[PDB]
Write a protein that binds this ligand. Structure first.
Ligand SMILES: Cc1cn([C@H]2C[C@H](O)[C@@H](COP(=O)(O)OP(=O)(O)O[C@H]3O[C@@H](C)[C@H](O)[C@@H](O)[C@H]3O)O2)c(=O)[nH]c1=O
Ligand SMILES: Cc1cn([C@H]2C[C@H](O)[C@@H](COP(=O)(O)OP(=O)(O)O[C@H]3O[C@@H](C)[C@H](O)[C@@H](O)[C@H]3O)O2)c(=O)[nH]c1=O
Lengths: 184, 184
């Protein structure tokens, strides 16, 4: 059968997916999501209630974001360009608390990352432009939104960046990891 | 509140959606799906179990497709280029049986179409290339796949096409509407 390669990252609950793309003389076709395969690799049920689509110029960084209530599990990919995509483990009781994982996702490699509730998430744009799409397990709730600053010295994330990133003001004003609201 | 304009088409159960795109100096962001708004405009619950992504060159036509068992309701859009997107009512007992609706969907207008189970669906590519994404209420089942030929004379679909379309062989070999398996 044809489906989707699944790899658990250094932080096992983070999973990297890679789809099969079928070519023919009209162009191509692939399954960007399949609930049977996803729940099989995930090991538990999931419902996605919202899909999001953003476009960002080279050097833009969005993160590090989470919702401390109505927490959102996220399945993410890029359909134009390339990003470096990061997950940070904010579960105090996890043995990988304060650790992070990062992978390059692009329109061309078509790779995806599953990021469970309990994590902060961010990405930075490496190409001229990038369009970034993702599905979430709960709805947008601004009152519950939190942020950790991208260049926190305790987290020490190895961003593959050349120039200083462009950020929203609320991302520039992100909290230090030591002062941040974390999960159990 | 910010959300998604909804319009019922000439065949009322077909719905055209139009999202709000928020610009800022990083680029843009929009909600491509929201279950609260969708089920509110739809008037009933829906679960999507599979997402699909295809790329096609100018003049390619894919259709007219349905699954007679494990029938798939479809929510569709384009993220690169422009297509003419068509829904045909195949419910024998509907007063709009044998009728169709069509709209232009593009990367730029970001409009979407909801096509319930009971309909055939097709599109044709109007730009150099088009990438077409959609979410479905059931899984792929080849044994149940059926096709009606794009240029059926009873259906008389007004394709905005210049040259003869490029088709898969199984689409070139599609059934006449008069000989096709239909829904109740
Ligand atoms: C997150 C979100 C924003 N918006 C609107 C509010 C703003 O006007 C505009 C941009 O909001 P921002 O919070 O600046 O978007 P953003 O792209 O900086 O935020 C996102 O970043 C990702 C890295 C995270 O994984 C997401 O969970 C989310 O935090 O979009 C929605 O309508 N729905 C949403 O779900
Ligand atoms: C439809 C489908 C195809 N495939 C594979 C089988 C083939 O190798 C390749 C292309 O198959 P095709 O049937 O030629 O794809 P297609 O793009 O011609 O078919 C699609 O057309 C849309 C207009 C309809 O709304 C869809 O319901 C579907 O019928 O993709 C999947 O893996 N999963 C799927 O769900």
């Amino acid at each position: 059968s044809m489906a989707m390669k699944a790899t658990r990252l250094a932080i096992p609950d983070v999973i990297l997916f890679e789809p099969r793309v079928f070519g023919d003389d009209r162009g191509f076709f692939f399954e960007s999501y399949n609930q049977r395969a996803f729940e099989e690799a995930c090991g538990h049920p999931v419902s996605f209630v919202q899909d999001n689509h953003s476009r960002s110029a080279r050097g833009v960084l969005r993160g590090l974001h989470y919702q401390i209530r109505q927490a959102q599990g996220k399945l993410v990919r890029a359909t134009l360009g390339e990003v470096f995509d990061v997950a940070v483990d904010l579960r105090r009781g996890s043995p990988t608390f304060g650790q992070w994982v990062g992978e390059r996702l692009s329109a061309e490699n078509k790779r995806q990352m599953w990021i469970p509730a309990g994590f902060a998430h961010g990405f930075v744009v490496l190409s001229e432009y990038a369009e970034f799409l993702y599905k979430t397990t709960d709805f947008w709730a601004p009152e519950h939104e939190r942020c950790i600053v991208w260049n926190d010295p305790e987290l020490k994330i190895d961003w593959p960046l050349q120039d200083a990133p462009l950020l929203s003001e609320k991302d520039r004003q992100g909290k230090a990891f030591a002062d941040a609201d974390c999960f159990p």
